[PDB]
Amino acid sequence: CGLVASNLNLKPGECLRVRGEVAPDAKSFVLNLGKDSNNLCLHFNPRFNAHGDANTIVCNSKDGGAWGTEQREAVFPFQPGSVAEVCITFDQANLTVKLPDGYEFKFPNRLNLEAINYMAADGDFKIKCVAFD
Amino acid sequence: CGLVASNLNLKPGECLRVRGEVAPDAKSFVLNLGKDSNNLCLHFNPRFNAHGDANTIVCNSKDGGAWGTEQREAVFPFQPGSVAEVCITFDQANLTVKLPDGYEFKFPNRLNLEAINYMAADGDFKIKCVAFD
Numbered sequence: 001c002g003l004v005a006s007n008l009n010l011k012p013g014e015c016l017r018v019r020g021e022v023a024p025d026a027k028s029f030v031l032n033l034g035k036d037s038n039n040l041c042l043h044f045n046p047r048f049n050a051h052g053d054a055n056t057i058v059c060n061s062k063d064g065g066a067w068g069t070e071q072r073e074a075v076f077p078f079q080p081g082s083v084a085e086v087c088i089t090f091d092q093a094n095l096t097v098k099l100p101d102g103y104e105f106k107f108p109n110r111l112n113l114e115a116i117n118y119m120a121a122d123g124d125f126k127i128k129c130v131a132f133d
Numbered sequence: 134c135g136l137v138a139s140n141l142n143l144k145p146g147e148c149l150r151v152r153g154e155v156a157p158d159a160k161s162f163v164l165n166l167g168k169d170s171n172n173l174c175l176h177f178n179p180r181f182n183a184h185g186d187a188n189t190i191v192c193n194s195k196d197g198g199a200w201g202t203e204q205r206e207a208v209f210p211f212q213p214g215s216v217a218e219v220c221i222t223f224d225q226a227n228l229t230v231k232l233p234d235g236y237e238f239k240f241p242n243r244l245n246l247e248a249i250n251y252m253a254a255d256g257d258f259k260i261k262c263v264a265f266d
C-alpha cells in the first residue's frame with residue numbers, strides 16, 4: 001500500500017501532478033482520487049499485465065462503496081522501468097487526465113464533490129513527487 | 134487543516150522535501166512528522182508571533198499522545214508572504230532539518246524511529262509540493 005493523502009482541497013481547475021517510477025516488472029498501479037476510500041471520483045488503473053488485461057488503462061468511480069461502470073481507454077503511454085508523470089484536473093462535468101506521450105482523456109465526474117480531498121496510490125508505481133496547484 | 138499524508142515510507146538518510154507558501158499574515162505554521170498523529174518524532178513549529186514567542190522555531194516530540202520537552206532554535210529564516218522549502222532527513226540519533234538560506238539544525242530522534250510514515254501540515258503554510266529522494 002502506497003501514499004495516501006487527505007485534506008488536499010483540490011478545487012475545480014486546479015492541477016494535481018504525480019510523478020513516480022514504474023517498476024521494471026510492473027503489473028499494474030492505481031491512483032485513486034475523491035473524498036475517501038469509499039468515494040472515488042476517479043480510480044485510475046493502468047494494467048500492464050493484470051486481470052487478463054495487457055497494456056490497458058482501466059478507469060472507474062466508486063460512490064458510497066459501489067463501483068460504477070468501468071471504462072477503458074485505447075492508448076497506453078507507460079513503460080515498465082521508467083519514470084512517468086500523471087496530471088489531473090476536474091470540473092463538475094469531467095476529470096481530465098494528462099499522461100505521457102501527449103495523451104489526454106476525460107472521465108465523467110459521477111460524484112458530487114466540491115473539492116478532491118483524498119488521494120491514494122497502490123501497486124507498482126513508486127511516488128517521487130506530488131504537486132498541488 | 135492542512136495536508137495529511139500517510140504511508141510515506143521515509144527511511145534513514147532519505148530526503149523529504151516540502152515546498153509551500155507562507156501566508157501573508159502568518160502567525161505560526163506547523164509540520165508534523167512521525168509514525169502517526171500520536172507519535173511524532175518532529176513537531177516543527179516556526180512562530181512569527183504565537184504562544185509567547187516572536188520569530189522562533191519551536192520543536193517538540195509527541196510519544197503516545199504525550200508532548201515532550203520543547204527545544205527552541207537559534208535561527209529564523211522565514212518571512213510572511215513568501216515561498217519556502219524545508220528538507221528533512223533522519224537517522225538513529227537525530228532529525229536534520231534544512232531550512233531556507235543555508236540554515237540547518239538537528240533535533241534528537243527521541244522515539245528512535247527507523248521509519249517516518251506520517252506527515253501533517255497546519256497553520257499559515259500552504260503545501261505546494263512534496264518530493265522524496
Ligand SMILES: CCCO[C@@H]1O[C@H](CO)[C@@H](O[C@@H]2O[C@H](CO)[C@H](O)[C@H](OCc3cn(Cc4ccccc4)nn3)[C@H]2O)[C@H](O)[C@H]1NC(C)=O
Nearest residue numbers: 028029030043045051058059060067069070071122123124
Ligand atoms: C464478468 C465480468 C468481470 O469483469 C471484470 O471484473 C473484475 C472484478 O470486478 C474487474 O476488476 C476490478 O476493476 C475495478 C475497476 O472497475 C478495480 O480496478 C478492481 O480492483 C480494485 C483495487 C485493487 N487494488 C489493490 C492493488 C491494485 C493494483 C496493484 C496492487 C494492488 N486496489 N484497488 C478490480 O478488481 C475487471 O476489471 C473486470 N474486467 C472486465 C473486462 O470488465
Ligand SMILES: CCCO[C@@H]1O[C@H](CO)[C@@H](O[C@@H]2O[C@H](CO)[C@H](O)[C@H](OCc3cn(Cc4ccccc4)nn3)[C@H]2O)[C@H](O)[C@H]1NC(C)=O
Nearest residue numbers: 161162163176178184185186191192193200203255256257
Ligand atoms: C503563556 C505561556 C505558556 O507556555 C506555552 O504553553 C503552550 C501550550 O502548552 C505552548 O504551546 C503548544 O506547544 C506545543 C509544542 O510544544 C504545540 O505547538 C501546541 O500547538 C499544537 C498545534 C496546534 N495546531 C493548529 C495550528 C497551528 C498553527 C496555526 C494555526 C493552527 N497544530 N498543532 C502549542 O499550543 C507554548 O509553546 C508555550 N510557550 C512558552 C513560551 O512556553
